[PDB]
Design a protein around this ligand. Structure first.
Ligand SMILES: CCCCCCCO[C@@H]1O[C@H](CO)[C@@H](O)[C@H](O)[C@H]1O
Ligand SMILES: CCCCCCCO[C@@H]1O[C@H](CO)[C@@H](O)[C@H](O)[C@H]1O
Ligand SMILES: CCCCCCCCCCCCCCCC
Ligand SMILES: CCCCCCCCCCCC
Ligand SMILES: CCCCCCCCCCCC
Ligand SMILES: CCCCCCCCCCCC
Ligand SMILES: CCCCCCCCCC
Ligand SMILES: CCCCCCCC
Ligand SMILES: [K+]
Ligand SMILES: [K+]
Ligand SMILES: [K+]
Lengths: 263, 271
């Protein structure tokens, strides 16, 4: 009977409206600086070469925008990586199928590969969850009868989870993907979160300016954030009830307050 | 007995791992047999237009022409209309696009081609996703249950208008067909038919769009403002629809797993 979904719907709508104003307050500034200087390279290029004219630079952009549709890809291994992005729903989509048969196959290949891969990820999650269960069984005997109480013991372990998990999964896999002479510090964490949350794989680089072991870290990392996101959902559930009781309690005191004023 | 079921679980996981490995190898060979031919025809003819347009203007910087193309392709990763006509441009981080961007983040659909460049935008996006993805899941789960009872009501009338004389175990299969029928007509067919008249997508390219989107794999939004809010709410319920569809397909694979798991066991035993 009681819906309770529309209230969550409004929070999500409100959460998006906040996120909207924040992203445009962080990205629209740099959007101007780029796109004002892009005019500068176009204004400089026609001056640097009277050989090429206005009518001809548009033709080049057209022929480069036409090349966006294509970009050797689809080789023995690239189509393997593509199929991995499909069943993991990461789907970076820089190289997407252009053939009618390739799209029809991709529809069926996804409708069957996504559930199939789900059983793998679920089994890897349980398999890795017990590995973590053994790792805490030794930690939950050598530190428990000490002074840290029942409600606090649970928190030290969750810190050891986040630190030992995230430090592994932001340092090694992002680099094990492209492993030496590492990277910018932030774009490794940004790469990992965007990838393992199945959001879309932050910008493959080929250095213009391993197969079982790499998909190991991916499969373990996807299972890692699968639990990480699920815990965050649990902490949101707690904070939901803690804020549910606070309002109904404040609305309870403000109600009898108003009755006292009517005297 | 405690770690005896785990001796039995690890066997089941690695076999599913091998199925996934082989499933990717099959998929790999199928895509590269369908797409790599069209790639050769494209790259051989894109060299022709370099060999054409560079002989058509020898006075352009030959060795530096590739550097211009890189700097143009590097600009493609961001929003660009770098042309002599229409130097005026529109922001892809405007009032409504960054709203759509946040939607692709919490739904994990993802980014189209453009992603945040600012360090502050990347740090916020990490926090926004780690909190937005779980938040959205509660909505999607509530939408699924809210939609599941609407289906439970719609099937309650259908499961009485066909109750003749004589079973319980068989009516459940008719109910799953009327799910896929109404479901794929409402959530896959009707919107795919509507996108034909808006962006001119071929018949397949609309279904392919719906599947890739609502299976959160990852554009009709640009038209160059009355239907984007409606489509967004189609997406929310369509995401809840494929959530169950993918879940059923997984259950169908559990059945097909055991039926083949028992078939090999008997064929090995009797022979
Ligand atoms: C600049 C300070 C770097 C602090 C870390 C010191 C170790 O460097 C790393 O050594 C690794 C090989 O063992 C390689 O991955 C890279 O050559 C390098 O990244
Ligand atoms: C147990 C997992 C072992 C995985 C091996 C990964 C291969 O990377 C190597 O591992 C070293 C740290 O281990 C790095 O410092 C080196 O840069 C690199 O040569
Ligand atoms: C980017 C972070 C967004 C934070 C949004 C906080 C919204 C809080 C909603 C408060 C309303 C809850 C109503 C509960 C009624 C019982
Ligand atoms: C115009 C042709 C469209 C063909 C669509 C085929 C869909 C296949 C569904 C497979 C379900 C597992
Ligand atoms: C940093 C705070 C982010 C928002 C966390 C709470 C969002 C939901 C609370 C209300 C749920 C009913
Ligand atoms: C594209 C579908 C691939 C199907 C592969 C079937 C593999 C079954 C192996 C049976 C082992 C018991
Ligand atoms: C380098 C600038 C960091 C900006 C972080 C913005 C966080 C906003 C949280 C509401
Ligand atoms: C129908 C293709 C998947 C194979 C099902 C059997 C998995 C053990
Ligand atoms: K998913
Ligand atoms: K996804
Ligand atoms: K995605």
């Amino acid at each position: 009977k009681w819906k309770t979904v529309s209230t969550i719907f409004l929070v999500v709508v409100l959460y998006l409206i906040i996120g909207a104003t924040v992203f445009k307050a962080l990205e629209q500034p740099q959007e101007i600086s780029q796109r004002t200087t892009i005019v500068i390279q176009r204004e400089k290029f026609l001056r640097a070469h009277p050989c090429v004219s206005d009518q001809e630079l548009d033709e080049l952009i057209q022929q480069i925008v036409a090349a966006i549709n294509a970009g050797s890809h689809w080789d023995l291994g690239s189509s393997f990586f593509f199929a991995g992005t499909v069943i993991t729903t990461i789907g970076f989509g820089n190289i997407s199928p252009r053939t009618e048969g390739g799209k029809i196959f991709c529809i069926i290949y996804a409708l069957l590969g996504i559930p199939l891969f789900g059983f793998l990820l679920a089994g890897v999650g349980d398999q890795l969850g017990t590995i973590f269960g053994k790792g805490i069984a030794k930690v939950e005997d050598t530190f428990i009868k000490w002074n840290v109480s029942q409600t606090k013991i649970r928190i030290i372990s969750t810190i050891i989870f986040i630190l030992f998990g995230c430090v592994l999964f932001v340092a090694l896999p992002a680099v094990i993907f492209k492993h030496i002479e590492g990277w910018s510090a932030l774009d490794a964490i940004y790469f990992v979160v965007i990838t393992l949350t199945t959001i879309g794989f932050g910008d493959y680089v080929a250095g213009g300016s391993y197969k079982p072991v790499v998909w190991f870290w991916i499969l373990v990392g996807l299972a890692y954030f699968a639990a990480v996101l699920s815990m965050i959902g649990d902490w949101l559930r707690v904070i939901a009830k803690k804020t549910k009781e606070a309002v109904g309690e404040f609305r309870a005191h403000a109600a009898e307050w108003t009755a006292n004023v009517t005297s």
